[PDB]
Amino acid sequence: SGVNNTKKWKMEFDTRERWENPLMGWSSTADPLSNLVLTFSTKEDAVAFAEKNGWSFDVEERKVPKPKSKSYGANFSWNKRTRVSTK
Amino acid sequence: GALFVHRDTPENNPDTPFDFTPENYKRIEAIVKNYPEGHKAAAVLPVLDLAQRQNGWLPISAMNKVAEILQVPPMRVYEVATFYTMYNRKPVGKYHIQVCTTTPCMLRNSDSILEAIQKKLGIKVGETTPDKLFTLIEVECLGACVNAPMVQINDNYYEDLTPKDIEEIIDELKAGKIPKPGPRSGRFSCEPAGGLTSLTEPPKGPGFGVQAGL
Amino acid sequence: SNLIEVFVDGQSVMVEPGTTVLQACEKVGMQIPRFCYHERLSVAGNCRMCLVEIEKAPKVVAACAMPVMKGWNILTNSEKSKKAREGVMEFLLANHPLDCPICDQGGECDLQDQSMMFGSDRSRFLEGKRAVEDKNIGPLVKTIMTRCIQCTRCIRFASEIAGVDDLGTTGRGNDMQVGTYIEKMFMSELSGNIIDICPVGALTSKPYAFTARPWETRKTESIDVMDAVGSNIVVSTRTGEVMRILPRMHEDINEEWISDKTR
Amino acid sequence: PKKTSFGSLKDEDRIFTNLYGRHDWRLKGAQSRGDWYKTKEILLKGPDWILGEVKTSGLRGRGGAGFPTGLKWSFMNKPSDGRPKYLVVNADEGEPGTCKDREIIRHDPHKLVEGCLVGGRAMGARAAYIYIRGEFYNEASNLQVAIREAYEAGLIGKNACGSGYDFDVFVVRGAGAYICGEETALIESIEGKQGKPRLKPPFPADVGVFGCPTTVANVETVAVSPTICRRGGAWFASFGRERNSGTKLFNISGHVNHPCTVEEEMSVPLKELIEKHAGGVIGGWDNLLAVIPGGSSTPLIPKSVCETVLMDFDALVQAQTGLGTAAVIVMDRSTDIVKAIARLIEFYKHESCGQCTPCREGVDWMNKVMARFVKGDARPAEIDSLWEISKQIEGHTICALGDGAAWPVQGLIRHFRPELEERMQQFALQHQ
Amino acid sequence: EPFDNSTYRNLQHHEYSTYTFLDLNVELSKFRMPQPSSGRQSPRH
Numbered sequence A: 001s002g003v004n005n006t007k008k009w010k011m012e013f014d015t016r017e018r019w020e021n022p023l024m025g026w027s028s029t030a031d032p033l034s035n036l037v038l039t040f041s042t043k044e045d046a047v048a049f050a051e052k053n054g055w056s057f058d059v060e061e062r063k064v065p066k067p068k069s070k071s072y073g074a075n076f077s078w079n080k081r082t083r084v085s086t087k
Numbered sequence B: 001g002a003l004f005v006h007r008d009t010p011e012n013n014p015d016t017p018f019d020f021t022p023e024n025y026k027r028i029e030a031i032v033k034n035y036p037e038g039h040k041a042a043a044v045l046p047v048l049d050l051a052q053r054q055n056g057w058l059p060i061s062a063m064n065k066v067a068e069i070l071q072v073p074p075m076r077v078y079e080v081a082t083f084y085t086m087y088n089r090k091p092v093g094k095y096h097i098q099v100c101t102t103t104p105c106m107l108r109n110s111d112s113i114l115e116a117i118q119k120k121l122g123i124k125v126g127e128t129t130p131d132k133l134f135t136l137i138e139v140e141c142l143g144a145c146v147n148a149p150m151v152q153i154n155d156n157y158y159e160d161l162t163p164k165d166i167e168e169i170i171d172e173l174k175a176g177k178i179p180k181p182g183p184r185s186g187r188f189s190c191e192p193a194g195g196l197t198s199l200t201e202p203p204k205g206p207g208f209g210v211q212a213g214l
Numbered sequence C: 001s002n003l004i005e006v007f008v009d010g011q012s013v014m015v016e017p018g019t020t021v022l023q024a025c026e027k028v029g030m031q032i033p034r035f036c037y038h039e040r041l042s043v044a045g046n047c048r049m050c051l052v053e054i055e056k057a058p059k060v061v062a063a064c065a066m067p068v069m070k071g072w073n074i075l076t077n078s079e080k081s082k083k084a085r086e087g088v089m090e091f092l093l094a095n096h097p098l099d100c101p102i103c104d105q106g107g108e109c110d111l112q113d114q115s116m117m118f119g120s121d122r123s124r125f126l127e128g129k130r131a132v133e134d135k136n137i138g139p140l141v142k143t144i145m146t147r148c149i150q151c152t153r154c155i156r157f158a159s160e161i162a163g164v165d166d167l168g169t170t171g172r173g174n175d176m177q178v179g180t181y182i183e184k185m186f187m188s189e190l191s192g193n194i195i196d197i198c199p200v201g202a203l204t205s206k207p208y209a210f211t212a213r214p215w216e217t218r219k220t221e222s223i224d225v226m227d228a229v230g231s232n233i234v235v236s237t238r239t240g241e242v243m244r245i246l247p248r249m250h251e252d253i254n255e256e257w258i259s260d261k262t263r
Numbered sequence D: 001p002k003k004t005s006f007g008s009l010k011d012e013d014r015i016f017t018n019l020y021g022r023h024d025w026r027l028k029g030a031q032s033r034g035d036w037y038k039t040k041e042i043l044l045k046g047p048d049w050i051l052g053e054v055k056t057s058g059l060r061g062r063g064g065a066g067f068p069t070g071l072k073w074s075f076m077n078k079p080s081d082g083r084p085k086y087l088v089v090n091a092d093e094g095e096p097g098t099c100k101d102r103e104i105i106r107h108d109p110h111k112l113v114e115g116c117l118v119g120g121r122a123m124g125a126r127a128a129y130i131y132i133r134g135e136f137y138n139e140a141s142n143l144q145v146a147i148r149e150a151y152e153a154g155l156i157g158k159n160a161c162g163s164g165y166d167f168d169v170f171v172v173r174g175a176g177a178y179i180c181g182e183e184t185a186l187i188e189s190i191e192g193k194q195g196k197p198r199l200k201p202p203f204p205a206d207v208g209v210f211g212c213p214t215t216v217a218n219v220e221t222v223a224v225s226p227t228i229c230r231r232g233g234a235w236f237a238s239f240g241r242e243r244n245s246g247t248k249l250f251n252i253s254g255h256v257n258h259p260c261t262v263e264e265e266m267s268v269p270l271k272e273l274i275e276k277h278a279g280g281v282i283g284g285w286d287n288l289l290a291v292i293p294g295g296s297s298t299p300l301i302p303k304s305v306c307e308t309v310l311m312d313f314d315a316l317v318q319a320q321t322g323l324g325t326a327a328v329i330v331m332d333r334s335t336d337i338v339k340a341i342a343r344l345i346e347f348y349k350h351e352s353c354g355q356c357t358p359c360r361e362g363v364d365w366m367n368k369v370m371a372r373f374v375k376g377d378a379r380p381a382e383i384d385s386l387w388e389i390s391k392q393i394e395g396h397t398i399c400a401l402g403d404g405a406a407w408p409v410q411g412l413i414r415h416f417r418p419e420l421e422e423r424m425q426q427f428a429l430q431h432q
Numbered sequence E: 001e002p003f004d005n006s007t008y009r010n011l012q013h014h015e016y017s018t019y020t021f022l023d024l025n026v027e028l029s030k031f032r033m034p035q036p037s038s039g040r041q042s043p044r045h
Ligand SMILES: Cc1cc2nc3c(=O)[nH]c(=O)nc-3n(C[C@H](O)[C@H](O)[C@H](O)COP(=O)(O)O)c2cc1C
Pocket: D060, D061, D062, D063, D064, D065, D066, D067, D072, D090, D091, D092, D093, D094, D095, D178, D179, D180, D181, D182, D183, D216, D217, D218, D219, D221, D399, D400, D401, D404
């Protein structure tokens, strides 16, 4: 329920092949740029890194919870069909 | 008991025979019309009590059936059935032997009365008689604390009891006889044990110190 | 116009009348700890962790179900607030079973993080903990009911978002068993969402069943294709396999729920 | 000019002229005792006059809260938005030691139903919801047949006492709980839901039963209302202390010679009450160990303070307790205070609402620790922790019963801490 | 007629049947008023 991990822009690279090692079942890969994420304060600063390092980037947008309206009085209404059946 | 996960059983199965008498149905409709429409589910508690009167305990079929008469989801009836006190989710004896051991009620040695019932019936706290007439189960403050340790026999109040006073009361119920619900002493309802210290002279009649026409 | 001026930790915020206290401090980043208040769900105040110190007030207030009005400074970090946070959380952890080594929610465990942030570092409990029998309500949701603490989250979700009025509470006191009473089978198109709204590791994904643990898995974002709504999902993968499918947040698309078909 | 002492309330001034059940509790006897007199003008004068004498009387809360009835009922004086206004009467009698309501439901029912009618007229309410405790069966039927008699007399309902106002009366029997005594649980229990109290403010005056403007009131609080308006608030303000005016039934129980209840002036020296009506604590006054002044929730008080302390809301407050419901419970010297408190707080555990975290986890935890103290297996350090968790319970609960169970623990600690300590050393000695 | 403070004439509660509560509740149902309407039949509607 906490929202501390959704306050910093992060840049990550695409996933590549993950084959199992013959000797013992492993997750061996051959893409060095696999476990490399980078935190960024704001989006324009994050993307400024991408062109500067010449990486074909894809940008999403900062999804934020829309502001809701909560009222404990609604749980017991006279006519409105929002009367909670049990607390 | 202290159980709250009902398990379907040969007697307490969802198909357990339960209904409401034609006399009963006109009582539920009286309960329903007493309460405003749009909130008729408020009548769940009186109806659930009424089912208890009809068939004693409350089988799961009885709780399910009253749920359909109240157009209420069956579990919502389940919650209120297993949250209150006199709703008997399991079969009980013909006379529910209730006793209070709260501090204002136990200060006058309620244990002696409770022990006296236990030895006379040969029934420990919680279980019922082998003949299924009496069930001695302890309850909290029932409301008559100003009197001596009292017992709630099924549905009537007996007060001012004594380790001897329950004895002849119990065997009265055993041998098909009801006693008089009330204090077992000279005190009628709540009067002082030594006599009367209030309401001595006749009360003032209608009309005393009315200011102007009111 | 209509905006009511209230203060949080001294700083003044501009809030729409009827705003709850919890929302007001959220506008500045202060996230009051919670266990019962879910934004998509109703408000119940059963959590008793959102207790916060009102300025020049004698009584700690429940930040969730309280409409804030003007001339109030929400003393989030006050000593009175922290003591209330400490008090109720110790009550929460009193009867939690020593399971989270094996409890699957270990790693998310909304109890663990809040204990690591708002809670003591030792237990003064000297009695025996209560144990609660498990109830089966699905081959897809596990129920170690002895762990969960007075949900009102499972209950509201069933009665508001899924409509299935089968989950409930049974009894009072310390036990007050939460479940279905009779042996019923909680199936709905959105039944699986009780798993990710469970702060405690009682309602857990039965197909998951300790396949992996949170820190080791990598989360990638995608869109489900099982339905045509197109719910945004998070495909948690590790070592080259998919263990869990989690619902992302997209509001208008899927809120934060996904169908059991997609999960 | 002012009453230096208090007590010996005039018998004519005793509001409940049938509290002992020694007079006809039917309609005919009630009106023969002053009931149902000039209700016409009482209903005709409107809420403004009815509430005016309530302000003049300054009736304090008789249900265990002590809140002034005046402004509490004044919250209803407000134009209707469409939601019908209701009035409910709390008759749970949940508190151990409470018996005052139980007797006066059956002994003078018509006075109570007339009390609702006068209260409802000021309240602008539509229907009366007297929520009687389910165990209270015979008295509930006694009150209901009284309502039928009043209905046949055309006193309530259609054209109440020929005044145009229409006020219905319903007797709803509960299904057994302390918690239903709480005002929001009573609303929840009436609504057919689980008897779990709802949160704080949305207010009952705004959102009450079925989401309608309502206000709970103790049975005695509305019982005195007719006698209030007929004789004015000047009746009630004459007796009692400064903002502790009026009279009240006093549930004297426990280790006393004559356990009984009695209507008497309030703010009376506590020694006078237990010595006059109860004939002193058994074994004499010196045999008294502690007194629970009103209700279990209010902390107990040792005899060192019981010498004088007047029985009124303020006087109990500096006595580190409260008047509550004037349920006088008296322990003697032979009484084990630790055992009595454990029995008291074990009752709270059984009658715990279960909703909120503190009162559910803490009170059950209070049971475990306090049970260990009674046996004595505990260690001396745990005494203060019980105090700490008691403060954690206090003020952190939706229901006031949590604070109603923390106070007895605090009262026991503050007044008899050596008693547990020596009892604690006794266990550590014989067990070795 | 004479004032006698020695009788508990409240004794009709002794011969009270279990059904009595609802039994006489049925009979005054005539002496009631039409209950207010919430509009919708039930909160589930
Ligand atoms: C746990 C609990 C139980 C209560 N039980 C009762 C009761 O049995 N009778 C009562 O009159 N008030 C009781 N009250 C007090 C109510 O909150 C409320 O003050 C009362 O119903 C009406 O008080 P008033 O007449 O002063 O308005 C209880 C409160 C709590 C918290």
